[PDB]
Protein backbone atom coordinates (compact mmCIF):
# COMPACT_ATOMS: atom_id res chain seq x y z
CA UNK A 1 0.00 0.00 0.00
CA UNK A 2 0.98 3.66 0.36
CA UNK A 3 3.12 2.66 3.35
CA UNK A 4 5.09 0.33 1.08
CA UNK A 5 5.15 2.97 -1.67
CA UNK A 6 6.65 5.48 0.76
CA UNK A 7 9.14 2.91 2.04
CA UNK A 8 10.11 2.32 -1.58
CA UNK A 9 10.51 6.10 -1.86
CA UNK A 10 12.99 5.95 1.04
CA UNK A 11 14.43 2.43 0.94
CA UNK A 12 17.12 2.29 -1.73
CA UNK A 13 17.54 0.68 -5.12
CA UNK A 14 19.24 -2.72 -5.20
CA UNK A 15 19.85 -4.63 -8.42
CA UNK A 16 18.33 -8.08 -8.74
CA UNK A 17 21.34 -10.39 -8.52
CA UNK A 18 20.50 -12.60 -11.50
CA UNK A 19 23.35 -11.59 -13.87
CA UNK A 20 20.94 -11.86 -16.81
CA UNK A 21 19.30 -8.46 -17.34
CA UNK A 22 19.62 -4.97 -15.87
CA UNK A 23 16.73 -5.61 -13.47
CA UNK A 24 17.54 -2.69 -11.18
CA UNK A 25 15.16 -3.23 -8.28
CA UNK A 26 14.28 -0.96 -5.37
CA UNK A 27 14.13 -3.04 -2.19
CA UNK A 28 11.51 -2.28 0.46
CA UNK A 29 10.38 -5.53 2.09
CA UNK A 30 8.18 -4.74 5.09
CA UNK A 31 5.13 -6.54 6.49
CA UNK A 32 1.74 -6.54 4.72
CA UNK A 33 3.50 -6.85 1.37
CA UNK A 34 6.66 -5.24 0.04
CA UNK A 35 7.86 -2.84 -2.66
CA UNK A 36 10.41 -4.29 -5.09
CA UNK A 37 10.19 -1.95 -8.08
CA UNK A 38 12.12 -3.72 -10.84
CA UNK A 39 12.91 -2.09 -14.19
CA UNK A 40 14.31 -4.12 -17.09
CA UNK A 41 15.57 -1.11 -19.14
CA UNK A 42 12.88 -1.89 -21.75
CA UNK A 43 9.65 -1.45 -19.76
CA UNK A 44 8.35 0.44 -16.72
CA UNK A 45 6.82 -1.11 -13.61
CA UNK A 46 5.62 -0.37 -10.08
CA UNK A 47 5.51 -3.39 -7.76
CA UNK A 48 3.58 -1.75 -4.93
CA UNK A 49 2.28 -5.12 -3.78
CA UNK A 50 0.56 -6.13 -0.54
CA UNK A 51 0.80 -9.47 1.25
CA UNK A 52 -2.33 -10.87 -0.41
CA UNK A 53 -1.22 -10.08 -3.96
CA UNK A 54 2.32 -11.06 -2.91
CA UNK A 55 1.11 -14.54 -1.99
CA UNK A 56 -1.16 -14.91 -5.01
CA UNK A 57 1.72 -13.96 -7.32
CA UNK A 58 3.86 -16.53 -5.50
CA UNK A 59 1.13 -19.11 -6.11
CA UNK A 60 0.51 -18.15 -9.76
CA UNK A 61 3.77 -19.86 -10.77
CA UNK A 62 3.79 -22.51 -8.03
CA UNK A 63 2.19 -25.89 -8.72
CA UNK A 64 2.72 -28.20 -5.72
CA UNK A 65 4.59 -26.15 -3.07
CA UNK A 66 2.55 -23.47 -1.28
CA UNK A 67 2.18 -21.64 2.04
CA UNK A 68 -0.16 -19.37 4.03
CA UNK A 69 -0.32 -15.74 2.80
CA UNK A 70 1.81 -14.24 5.56
CA UNK A 71 3.98 -17.35 5.26
CA UNK A 72 4.62 -16.47 1.61
CA UNK A 73 5.28 -12.85 2.58
CA UNK A 74 7.84 -13.61 5.28
CA UNK A 75 9.33 -16.32 3.06
CA UNK A 76 10.01 -13.78 0.33
CA UNK A 77 11.32 -11.41 3.00
CA UNK A 78 13.82 -14.13 3.97
CA UNK A 79 14.47 -14.68 0.26
CA UNK A 80 16.25 -11.34 -0.12
CA UNK A 81 18.13 -11.77 3.17
CA UNK A 82 21.26 -13.58 1.85
CA UNK A 83 21.56 -11.85 -1.54
CA UNK A 84 19.45 -8.67 -1.82
CA UNK A 85 18.37 -7.46 1.64
CA UNK A 86 16.85 -18.43 -1.60
CA UNK A 87 19.66 -16.50 -3.31
CA UNK A 88 18.60 -17.54 -6.83
CA UNK A 89 17.36 -14.90 -9.27
CA UNK A 90 16.03 -14.98 -12.83
CA UNK A 91 13.32 -13.42 -14.98
CA UNK A 92 11.76 -13.20 -18.45
CA UNK A 93 12.46 -9.77 -19.92
CA UNK A 94 10.01 -10.38 -22.79
CA UNK A 95 6.92 -10.58 -20.55
CA UNK A 96 4.81 -7.44 -20.24
CA UNK A 97 4.46 -8.18 -16.52
CA UNK A 98 7.93 -8.47 -15.04
CA UNK A 99 7.77 -12.11 -13.93
CA UNK A 100 11.03 -12.28 -11.98
CA UNK A 101 11.64 -16.01 -12.23
CA UNK A 102 13.03 -16.25 -8.69
CA UNK A 103 13.37 -20.03 -8.37
CA UNK A 104 14.30 -20.11 -4.69
CA UNK A 105 14.15 -23.60 -3.18
CA UNK A 106 12.86 -24.62 0.23
CA UNK A 107 12.06 -28.35 0.09
CA UNK A 108 14.37 -29.71 -2.57
CA UNK A 109 11.19 -29.61 -4.68
CA UNK A 110 10.65 -26.73 -7.12
CA UNK A 111 9.25 -23.47 -5.77
CA UNK A 112 8.31 -20.67 -8.15
CA UNK A 113 8.47 -17.04 -7.03
CA UNK A 114 7.97 -14.04 -9.30
CA UNK A 115 8.48 -10.45 -8.22
CA UNK A 116 5.56 -9.74 -10.53
CA UNK A 117 5.65 -5.99 -11.06
CA UNK A 118 2.46 -4.20 -12.07
CA UNK A 119 2.86 -2.51 -15.44
CA UNK A 120 3.40 1.15 -14.59
CA UNK A 121 0.99 3.46 -16.35
CA UNK A 122 2.43 6.80 -17.52
CA UNK A 123 0.89 8.19 -14.33
CA UNK A 124 2.38 5.37 -12.23
CA UNK A 125 5.95 5.98 -13.44
CA UNK A 126 6.12 9.37 -11.70
CA UNK A 127 5.92 7.71 -8.26
CA UNK A 128 9.33 6.04 -8.32
CA UNK A 129 10.89 5.76 -11.79
CA UNK A 130 11.02 9.56 -12.08
CA UNK A 131 10.66 11.39 -8.75
CA UNK A 132 13.55 9.59 -6.98
CA UNK A 133 15.49 8.67 -10.13
CA UNK A 134 15.25 12.11 -11.73
CA UNK A 135 15.54 13.73 -8.30
CA UNK A 136 18.92 12.11 -7.72
CA UNK A 137 19.84 12.73 -11.37
CA UNK A 138 19.20 16.48 -11.08
CA UNK A 139 20.99 16.32 -7.73
CA UNK A 140 23.98 14.73 -9.47
CA UNK A 141 23.86 17.41 -12.18
CA UNK A 142 23.94 20.10 -9.49
CA UNK A 143 26.74 18.16 -7.78
CA UNK A 144 28.71 18.13 -11.03
CA UNK A 145 28.20 21.87 -11.53
CA UNK A 146 29.07 22.78 -7.93
CA UNK A 147 32.07 20.45 -7.81
CA UNK A 148 33.20 21.86 -11.17
CA UNK A 149 33.10 25.48 -10.02
CA UNK A 150 34.75 24.45 -6.75
CA UNK A 151 37.46 22.69 -8.77
CA UNK A 152 37.92 25.84 -10.86
CA UNK A 153 38.29 28.14 -7.84
CA UNK A 154 40.56 25.64 -6.06
CA UNK A 155 42.70 25.45 -9.20
CA UNK A 156 42.81 29.26 -9.22
CA UNK A 157 44.12 29.03 -5.66
CA UNK A 158 46.57 26.32 -6.77
CA UNK A 159 47.88 28.49 -9.62
CA UNK A 160 48.22 31.38 -7.17
CA UNK A 161 50.33 29.01 -5.07
CA UNK A 162 52.66 28.11 -7.95
CA UNK A 163 52.95 31.80 -8.87
CA UNK A 164 53.81 32.52 -5.22
CA UNK A 165 55.87 29.36 -4.75
CA UNK A 166 57.19 26.97 -7.41
CA UNK A 167 57.27 24.00 -5.02
CA UNK A 168 56.28 20.61 -6.43
CA UNK A 169 55.41 17.94 -3.87
CA UNK A 170 53.98 14.65 -5.12
CA UNK A 171 53.06 14.89 -8.84
CA UNK A 172 50.82 11.84 -8.24
CA UNK A 173 47.61 13.64 -7.26
CA UNK A 174 48.68 16.75 -9.20
CA UNK A 175 45.38 17.70 -10.80
CA UNK A 176 45.08 18.76 -14.40
CA UNK A 177 43.43 22.14 -15.06
CA UNK A 178 39.84 21.00 -14.71
CA UNK A 179 37.16 21.65 -17.32
CA UNK A 180 33.58 20.55 -16.68
CA UNK A 181 32.80 19.92 -20.35
CA UNK A 182 36.10 18.12 -20.92
CA UNK A 183 35.36 16.00 -17.85
CA UNK A 184 31.90 15.14 -19.19
CA UNK A 185 33.30 14.25 -22.62
CA UNK A 186 36.10 12.09 -21.22
CA UNK A 187 33.45 10.43 -19.06
CA UNK A 188 31.23 9.73 -22.10
CA UNK A 189 34.06 7.55 -23.49
CA UNK A 190 34.85 4.78 -21.00
CA UNK A 191 32.01 5.05 -18.47
CA UNK A 192 29.40 5.48 -21.20
CA UNK A 193 29.29 1.68 -21.77
CA UNK A 194 28.77 1.50 -18.01
CA UNK A 195 26.09 4.18 -18.39
CA UNK A 196 24.22 3.33 -21.60
CA UNK A 197 24.67 -0.43 -21.17
CA UNK A 198 23.86 -0.55 -17.46
CA UNK A 199 24.38 -4.29 -17.20
CA UNK A 200 24.43 -4.82 -13.46
CA UNK A 201 23.64 -1.37 -12.08
CA UNK A 202 25.67 -2.13 -8.93
CA UNK A 203 27.74 1.05 -9.51
CA UNK A 204 24.40 2.87 -9.68
CA UNK A 205 23.13 1.54 -6.34
CA UNK A 206 26.17 1.51 -4.08
CA UNK A 207 26.88 5.11 -5.21
CA UNK A 208 23.38 6.67 -5.56
CA UNK A 209 21.51 5.11 -2.66
CA UNK A 210 23.06 7.87 -0.55
CA UNK A 211 21.12 10.30 -2.75
CA UNK A 212 18.12 7.98 -2.53
CA UNK A 213 18.12 8.32 1.27
CA UNK A 214 16.97 11.95 0.92
CA UNK A 215 15.46 12.16 -2.59
CA UNK A 216 12.01 11.22 -1.14
CA UNK A 217 11.22 14.91 -0.57
CA UNK A 218 8.84 14.96 -3.54
Amino acid sequence: MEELEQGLLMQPWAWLQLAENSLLAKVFITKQGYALLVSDLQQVWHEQVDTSVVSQRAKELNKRLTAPPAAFLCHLDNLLRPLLKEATFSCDCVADALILRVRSELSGLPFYWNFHCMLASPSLVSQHLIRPLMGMSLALQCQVRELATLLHMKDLEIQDYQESGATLIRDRLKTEPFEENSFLEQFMIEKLPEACSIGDGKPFVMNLQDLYMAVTTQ
Binding site: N62, L65, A70, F72, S104, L106, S107
Partner: protein
Amino acid sequence: ESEISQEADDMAMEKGKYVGELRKALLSGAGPADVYTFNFSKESCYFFFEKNLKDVSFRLGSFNLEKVENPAEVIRELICYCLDTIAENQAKNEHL
Protein backbone atom coordinates in the same frame (compact mmCIF):
# COMPACT_ATOMS: atom_id res chain seq x y z
CA GLU B 1 3.58 -37.39 -0.64
CA SER B 2 1.56 -34.15 -0.58
CA GLU B 3 2.45 -33.79 3.12
CA ILE B 4 6.14 -33.54 2.14
CA SER B 5 6.27 -30.59 -0.30
CA GLN B 6 4.41 -27.44 0.77
CA GLU B 7 5.58 -27.58 4.41
CA ALA B 8 8.93 -26.02 3.44
CA ASP B 9 7.23 -22.86 2.21
CA ASP B 10 5.32 -22.91 5.50
CA MET B 11 8.53 -22.99 7.55
CA ALA B 12 9.59 -20.63 4.72
CA MET B 13 13.38 -20.89 5.05
CA GLU B 14 15.41 -21.92 2.02
CA LYS B 15 16.27 -25.44 0.89
CA GLY B 16 18.45 -27.95 2.72
CA LYS B 17 16.88 -27.20 6.09
CA TYR B 18 13.50 -28.77 5.29
CA VAL B 19 14.74 -32.23 4.25
CA GLY B 20 16.98 -32.54 7.30
CA GLU B 21 14.17 -31.30 9.53
CA LEU B 22 11.82 -33.96 8.16
CA ARG B 23 14.43 -36.69 8.59
CA LYS B 24 15.37 -35.65 12.13
CA ALA B 25 11.67 -35.57 13.01
CA LEU B 26 11.40 -39.12 11.65
CA LEU B 27 14.70 -40.06 13.29
CA SER B 28 16.01 -38.99 16.70
CA GLY B 29 16.45 -35.28 17.38
CA ALA B 30 14.46 -32.08 17.87
CA GLY B 31 15.79 -28.54 18.19
CA PRO B 32 14.82 -26.02 20.86
CA ALA B 33 13.78 -23.34 18.35
CA ASP B 34 13.66 -25.57 15.25
CA VAL B 35 11.48 -27.97 17.24
CA TYR B 36 9.52 -30.60 15.34
CA THR B 37 6.56 -30.20 17.66
CA PHE B 38 5.19 -33.74 17.58
CA ASN B 39 1.53 -32.95 16.99
CA PHE B 40 0.78 -36.66 16.63
CA SER B 41 -2.89 -37.27 17.34
CA LYS B 42 -2.48 -40.70 18.92
CA GLU B 43 -6.04 -41.93 18.37
CA SER B 44 -6.52 -40.54 14.85
CA CYS B 45 -2.97 -41.59 13.86
CA TYR B 46 -1.67 -38.42 12.21
CA PHE B 47 1.77 -36.95 12.94
CA PHE B 48 2.82 -33.43 11.98
CA PHE B 49 5.16 -30.74 13.24
CA GLU B 50 4.86 -26.99 12.75
CA LYS B 51 7.57 -24.39 13.44
CA ASN B 52 5.12 -21.50 13.57
CA LEU B 53 6.30 -17.88 13.53
CA LYS B 54 6.32 -14.74 11.35
CA ASP B 55 2.71 -13.53 11.31
CA VAL B 56 1.04 -16.94 10.64
CA SER B 57 1.35 -20.61 11.55
CA PHE B 58 4.19 -22.39 9.74
CA ARG B 59 3.45 -26.07 9.20
CA LEU B 60 7.08 -27.20 9.23
CA GLY B 61 6.33 -30.85 8.48
CA SER B 62 3.50 -33.38 8.33
CA PHE B 63 3.73 -37.18 8.20
CA ASN B 64 0.53 -39.23 8.28
CA LEU B 65 0.47 -42.77 9.68
CA GLU B 66 -1.81 -45.85 9.78
CA LYS B 67 -2.64 -47.20 13.25
CA VAL B 68 -1.67 -50.84 13.70
CA GLU B 69 -4.55 -53.17 14.58
CA ASN B 70 -2.56 -54.72 17.43
CA PRO B 71 -0.62 -51.95 19.21
CA ALA B 72 1.54 -54.42 21.13
CA GLU B 73 3.14 -55.79 17.93
CA VAL B 74 5.66 -53.15 16.88
CA ILE B 75 6.10 -52.12 20.52
CA ARG B 76 7.29 -55.64 21.29
CA GLU B 77 9.44 -55.54 18.16
CA LEU B 78 11.13 -52.30 19.23
CA ILE B 79 11.64 -53.35 22.85
CA CYS B 80 13.02 -56.76 21.86
CA TYR B 81 15.42 -54.92 19.55
CA CYS B 82 16.42 -52.78 22.54
CA LEU B 83 17.02 -55.81 24.78
CA ASP B 84 18.95 -57.59 22.01
CA THR B 85 21.24 -54.60 21.58
CA ILE B 86 21.56 -54.38 25.39
CA ALA B 87 22.72 -58.00 25.64
CA GLU B 88 25.07 -57.51 22.68
CA ASN B 89 26.48 -54.38 24.34
CA GLN B 90 27.14 -56.18 27.63
CA ALA B 91 28.75 -59.25 26.03
CA LYS B 92 30.91 -57.24 23.66
CA ASN B 93 31.82 -54.93 26.55
CA GLU B 94 33.17 -57.78 28.66
CA HIS B 95 35.21 -58.93 25.61
CA LEU B 96 36.36 -55.27 25.32
